[PDB]
Amino acid sequence: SQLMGIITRLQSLQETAEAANEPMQRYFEVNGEKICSVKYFEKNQTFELTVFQKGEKPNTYPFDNIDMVSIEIFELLQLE
Amino acid sequence: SQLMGIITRLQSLQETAEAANEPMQRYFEVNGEKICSVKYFEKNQTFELTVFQKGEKPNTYPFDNIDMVSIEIFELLQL
Numbered sequence: 001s002q003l004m005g006i007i008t009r010l011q012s013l014q015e016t017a018e019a020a021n022e023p024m025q026r027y028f029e030v031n032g033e034k035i036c037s038v039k040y041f042e043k044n045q046t047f048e049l050t051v052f053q054k055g056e057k058p059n060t061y062p063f064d065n066i067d068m069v070s071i072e073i074f075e076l077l078q079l080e
Numbered sequence: 081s082q083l084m085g086i087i088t089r090l091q092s093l094q095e096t097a098e099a100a101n102e103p104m105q106r107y108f109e110v111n112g113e114k115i116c117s118v119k120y121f122e123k124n125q126t127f128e129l130t131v132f133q134k135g136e137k138p139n140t141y142p143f144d145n146i147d148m149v150s151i152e153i154f155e156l157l158q159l
Binding site: 008009012026027029032034 | 084085088089091092095096098099
């Protein structure tokens with residue numbers, strides 16, 4: 001399912017960030033368009049979600065739980 | 081599992097490719113030795129696998145499916 005796929009990607013995202021010992025990020029797009037990007041800071045075990053809006057400065061939201069950031073991303077992609 | 085790791089690396093290979101509208105590449109190894117290499121073509125939707133053979137030109141093989149190539153890579157590493 002889509003949700004399964006988002007969680008996997010976020011797990012490998014943190015996994016890759018811990019090894020590189022530096023923040024890492026990726027985008028989630030729907031139909032070729034960037035809807036949001038997530039950055040993992042191993043300065044804890046938190047995710048920072050950035051939500052794009054045309055002509056507007058993007059908004060960021062912190063999350064310390066992978067399941068909760070995944071849900072937010074999912075609902076965000078659902079509204080397309 | 082080892083296979084899952086190959087899949088997710090390729091998933092991001094493909095995805096970061098469509099983050100700047102340009103191809104992307106990656107190596108897969110066993111004990112520091114490069115076994116094969118992969119490149120993805122966004123404006124194409126294909127994965128190109130390059131397999132290495134000492135003292136010879138490498139063979140490239142196209143794939144339009146991430147699962148197909150992930151499998152091909154896994155079996156190459158298993159050897």
